[PDB]
């Protein structure tokens, strides 16, 4: 029985967030929290928010113990993109894609 | 599916020892290649190694006919510009006799992973002794 939290619409690319997700996949929650607390990556903040939300859900909605939990499942999906126009030299224009992502964290005994 | 292929786990490799004293190089190499590939067994299968182990002794006593001892050339290329190296049979048989047999049999075996595996079953020695007494090779007069 895994407990899920989802953070949707995080303003960061999935490719960047997956690097942080792979770092904590499969570890105990205390170890993962230490790693996220001392990381310098921007995606670490978002992943830590999702993990803490999942732990709180497991504690309050399902009455599980903190000490036995681990990151049993985590993956990052691509969200909706924002489209913008960047003017280049000599009257040429390029299209800019501002990417977002969805983070799913599951904790299980 | 009435015609059966040989199974690698059921193949039996037998050990034979051949003396090269006075034999013609190519006419010995054809028989060695045949027995390494397993063409002499009724369970022969093109994609399975069914051959035997061959130990060649007295490798530097092998002979070539005509004037090939001085005229037959062995080439290699270091891939640097102008890097073509050349030698002949007379020098090579005195220096590295096993390389002559390796070339002669490699040219007659199939070119691929199975051929690479097949040629690993040939052991060539210059002297009259070999270190494989534990495998009890049988004398094979080919």
């Amino acid at each position: 029985m895994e407990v899920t939290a989802k953070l949707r619409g995080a303003a960061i690319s999935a490719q960047k967030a997956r690097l942080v997700a792979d770092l904590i996949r499969g570890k105990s929650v205390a170890h993962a929290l230490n790693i996220l607390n001392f990381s310098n990556k921007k995606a670490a903040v978002l992943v830590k928010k999702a993990l803490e939300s999942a732990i709180a859900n497991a504690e309050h909605n399902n009455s599980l113990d903190v000490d036995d939990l681990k990151v049993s499942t985590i993956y990052v999906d691509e969200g909706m993109s924002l489209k913008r126009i960047m003017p280049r030299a000599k009257g040429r224009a390029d299209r800019i894609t501002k990417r977002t992502c969805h983070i799913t964290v599951k904790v299980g005994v | 599916m009435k015609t059966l292929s040989a199974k690698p786990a059921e193949v039996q490799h037998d050990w034979f020892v051949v003396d090269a004293t006075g034999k013609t190089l190519g006419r010995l190499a054809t028989e060695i290649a045949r027995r390494l590939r397993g063409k002499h067994k009724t369970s022969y299968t093109p994609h399975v190694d069914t051959g035997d182990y061959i130990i060649v002794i007295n490798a530097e006593q092998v002979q070539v006919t005509g004037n090939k001892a001085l005229d037959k050339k062995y080439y290699r290329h270091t891939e640097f510009p102008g890097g073509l190296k050349e030698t002949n049979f007379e020098k090579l048989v005195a220096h590295k006799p096993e390389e002559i047999f390796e070339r002669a049999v490699k040219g007659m075996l199939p070119k691929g992973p199975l051929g690479y595996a097949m040629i690993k079953k040939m052991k060539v020695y210059a002297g009259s002794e070999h270190p494989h007494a534990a495998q009890q090779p049988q004398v094979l007069d080919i």
Binding site: - | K2, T3, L4, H40
Partner: protein
Amino acid sequence: ARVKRGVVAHRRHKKILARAKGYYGARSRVYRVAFQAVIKAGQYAYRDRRQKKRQFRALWIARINAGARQNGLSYSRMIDGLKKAQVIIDRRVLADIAMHDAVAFAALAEKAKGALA
């Protein structure tokens, strides 16, 4: 009477992609590449249904040659001897017996060389 193409076109593309299962990369995902890959597979199969008979006959001949040389004959001489002895067993059965029954193959070779003599 306006006709929309979507349902039938989707069905045709899906059938092609289903036949292209297991291929590498775009060959199992992209319709154009997959369609080129299926036709070529059919062409190869048509050619190889003919090649298979030759390959299996070659295998039978090689095994018969090995058995005959174990019994003291060459393949060509053993075939000639069987022909003169009137035996009409084919190469598939001859190779099967050579592989699985050495005594029977020895008897066949003896018959062949007796007819040759």
